[PDB]
Scaffold this motif. Structure first.
Motif, short mmCIF file in Angstrom:
data_model
loop_
_atom_site.label_atom_id
_atom_site.label_comp_id
_atom_site.label_asym_id
_atom_site.label_seq_id
_atom_site.Cartn_x
_atom_site.Cartn_y
_atom_site.Cartn_z
N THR A 52 44.71 139.00 54.21
CA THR A 52 44.12 138.75 52.90
C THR A 52 43.18 139.93 52.54
OG1 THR A 52 44.15 136.37 53.26
CG2 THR A 52 42.76 137.18 51.48
N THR A 62 52.73 137.19 55.94
CA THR A 62 52.03 136.69 54.78
C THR A 62 50.97 137.68 54.32
OG1 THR A 62 52.34 134.38 55.46
CG2 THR A 62 50.71 134.84 53.78
N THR A 64 48.27 138.71 50.97
CA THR A 64 47.65 138.46 49.67
C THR A 64 46.67 139.57 49.34
OG1 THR A 64 47.75 136.09 50.02
CG2 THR A 64 46.24 136.82 48.36
N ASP A 65 46.77 140.20 48.18
CA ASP A 65 45.90 141.28 47.78
C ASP A 65 45.85 142.35 48.87
OD1 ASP A 65 43.56 138.81 46.48
OD2 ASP A 65 45.43 139.58 45.66
N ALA A 74 55.98 136.24 52.28
CA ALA A 74 55.04 135.74 51.27
C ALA A 74 54.19 136.94 50.86
CB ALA A 74 54.22 134.58 51.77
N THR A 76 51.84 138.33 47.77
CA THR A 76 51.16 138.11 46.49
C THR A 76 50.24 139.28 46.17
OG1 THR A 76 51.17 135.75 46.93
CG2 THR A 76 49.70 136.52 45.21
N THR B 38 36.72 132.88 50.36
CA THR B 38 38.02 133.17 50.92
C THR B 38 38.26 132.32 52.16
OG1 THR B 38 37.82 135.42 50.14
CG2 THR B 38 39.58 135.01 51.69
N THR B 40 41.22 131.39 55.25
CA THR B 40 42.49 131.49 55.98
C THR B 40 42.50 130.41 57.07
OG1 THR B 40 42.59 133.82 55.59
CG2 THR B 40 44.01 133.00 57.33
N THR B 50 40.43 132.33 46.90
CA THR B 50 41.65 132.72 47.57
C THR B 50 41.86 131.88 48.84
OG1 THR B 50 41.41 134.97 46.77
CG2 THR B 50 42.93 134.65 48.58
N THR B 52 44.74 131.01 52.03
CA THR B 52 45.95 131.23 52.81
C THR B 52 45.96 130.19 53.93
OG1 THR B 52 46.04 133.60 52.32
CG2 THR B 52 47.42 132.77 54.10
N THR B 62 44.33 131.94 43.67
CA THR B 62 45.44 132.39 44.46
C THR B 62 45.59 131.55 45.74
OG1 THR B 62 45.14 134.66 43.64
CG2 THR B 62 46.53 134.34 45.58
N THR B 64 48.44 130.63 49.03
CA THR B 64 49.64 130.77 49.85
C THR B 64 49.62 129.69 50.92
OG1 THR B 64 49.68 133.16 49.47
CG2 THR B 64 51.14 132.35 51.12
N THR B 76 52.10 130.30 46.08
CA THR B 76 53.25 130.47 46.94
C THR B 76 53.25 129.38 48.00
OG1 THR B 76 53.28 132.85 46.57
CG2 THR B 76 54.39 132.09 48.52
#
Lengths: 82, 82
Positions: A52, A62, A64-65, A74, A76, B38, B40, B50, B52, B62, B64, B76
Motif C-alpha cells: 500500500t 496486491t 494499492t497506490d 489486484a 489499484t 490506512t 492492512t 485506504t 487492504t 479505496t 481491496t 476490488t
C-alpha cells in the motif's frame, strides 16, 4: 532496532519509520524493505506480497497506490501491473 | 507499545501485529483500528481512507479484499461498495 532513525539493518520484525530495513518482514513508512512481506508507505518492497502506497513491489499479488507491481492481480492506482 | 502484544492503546503511530490499536494512525495485522487512516490485515478500520484485507472500512475511498466499503470508489473484491 526496528523503530525510527536512519538504519534498522538487524530488524527482522516490524520496521516502523526507519531509513533502512532490509531484513524486516513488515514495513511501515520505512526504506529499503527488500525482504518485507508487507509494506505500507515504504520503498524497495521488492518481495512484498502486499503493498500500500509503496515502491517497487515487483512480487506483490496486491498493490494499492504503489509502483512497479509486476505480478499484482489486484492493482489499484498502481504502475507496472500485468 | 505498537508492535506485538495484546494491548497497544498507547500507540499513536503505526501498529503492527497488535491486539488493540484504538489510537494508531496506521495498522498492519492489528485489531480495533478505529482511528487508522490506512489498514492492512486489520479490523474495525471505520475511519480509514485506504483498506487492504481489512474489516469495516465505512469511510474508505479505496478498498481491496475488504468489507463494508460503503463509500469506496476504488473497489476490488470488497463488499458493500457503491
Amino acid at each position: 532496532q526496528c523503530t525510527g532513525g536512519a538504519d534498522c539493518t538487524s530488524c527482522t520484525g516490524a520496521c516502523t519509520g526507519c531509513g533502512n530495513c532490509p531484513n524486516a518482514v513488515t514495513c511501515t513508512n520505512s526504506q529499503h524493505c527488500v525482504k518485507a512481506n508487507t509494506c505500507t508507505g515504504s520503498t524497495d518492497c521488492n518481495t512484498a506480497q502486499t503493498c500500500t502506497n509503496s515502491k517497487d513491489c515487483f512480487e506483490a499479488n496486491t498493490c494499492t497506490d504503489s509502483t512497479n507491481c509486476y505480478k499484482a492481480t489486484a492493482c489499484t492506482n498502481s504502475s507496472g501491473c500485468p
